[PDB]
Amino acid sequence: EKFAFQAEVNRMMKLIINSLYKNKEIFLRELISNASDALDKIRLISLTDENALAGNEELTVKIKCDKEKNLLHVTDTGVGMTREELVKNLGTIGTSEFLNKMTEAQTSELIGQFGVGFYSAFLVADKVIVTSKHNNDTQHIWESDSNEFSVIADPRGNTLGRGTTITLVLKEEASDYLELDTIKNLVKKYSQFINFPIYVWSSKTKTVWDWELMN
Ligand SMILES: CCNC(=O)[C@H]1O[C@@H](n2cnc3c(N)nc(I)nc32)[C@H](O)[C@@H]1O
Numbered sequence: 001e002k003f004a005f006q007a008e009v010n011r012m013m014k015l016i017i018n019s020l021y022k023n024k025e026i027f028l029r030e031l032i033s034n035a036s037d038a039l040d041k042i043r044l045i046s047l048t049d050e051n052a053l054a055g056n057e058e059l060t061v062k063i064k065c066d067k068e069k070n071l072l073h074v075t076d077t078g079v080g081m082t083r084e085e086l087v088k089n090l091g092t093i094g095t096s097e098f099l100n101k102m103t104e105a106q107t108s109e110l111i112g113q114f115g116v117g118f119y120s121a122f123l124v125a126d127k128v129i130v131t132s133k134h135n136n137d138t139q140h141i142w143e144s145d146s147n148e149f150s151v152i153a154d155p156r157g158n159t160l161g162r163g164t165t166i167t168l169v170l171k172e173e174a175s176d177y178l179e180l181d182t183i184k185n186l187v188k189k190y191s192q193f194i195n196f197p198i199y200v201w202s203s204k205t206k207t208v209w210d211w212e213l214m215n
Helices: 007-019 026-048 083-091 095-105 108-114 117-123 172-178 180-191
Strands: 061-066 071-076 125-133 140-144 149-153 163-170 198-204 208-213
Touching (some): 007 117, 026 071, 061 172, 095 108, 108 117, 117 163
Antiparallel strands (some): 061 071, 071 163
16 A cells, blocks of 8 residues: 655655745645646536536535644545546656756746646645545545655545545644634635635634635
């Protein structure tokens, strides 16, 4: 269940981290963008597949902060990833050209263009966990501290229905992303042009918690 990252991915992670150290908040923009892409994918599949949305009838992005556990969660009800996809799509990668472009650039816009924004999560996380459920497979968990990664069948079973949850164990210097005021402001900014509703789990005054629409 243990795997090593492809050399190119190791270099890419380092380039991204060294290039965006000044604007770490971009990680949320990238995770939201990826969630949107995943939702576009299942929507495209639903055009031809009548049972496509059976595992979860909604098309949304939901963000939750768990200050107590030092976790930030970004969940989408997109197409999800099979076990094989978790291993291949996150562990391997015009890569040589991009790597040269990044180096020749030192990148915010470039990263999104080449579709490697996911790795910016390491700008603010000591550990990145990806739980995913695809219609053609069972739920699995991918986890990595960037020095290796593992994939295991999720012992909780099918809790997502369909989709993916990106869970970030924040670095000590990234505790700000556990605060609602900050997350709501960033989510609002990065969700403006997303064509799917994005919600943040928040409080409202007793004190009641529920999903708050951000776009
Ligand atoms: C880390 C660089 N590679 C990726 O981010 C890829 O992993 C997969 N990925 C990342 N976030 C995802 C996400 N939220 N949903 C789905 I479906 N796939 C995702 C896609 O293939 C991305 O291009």
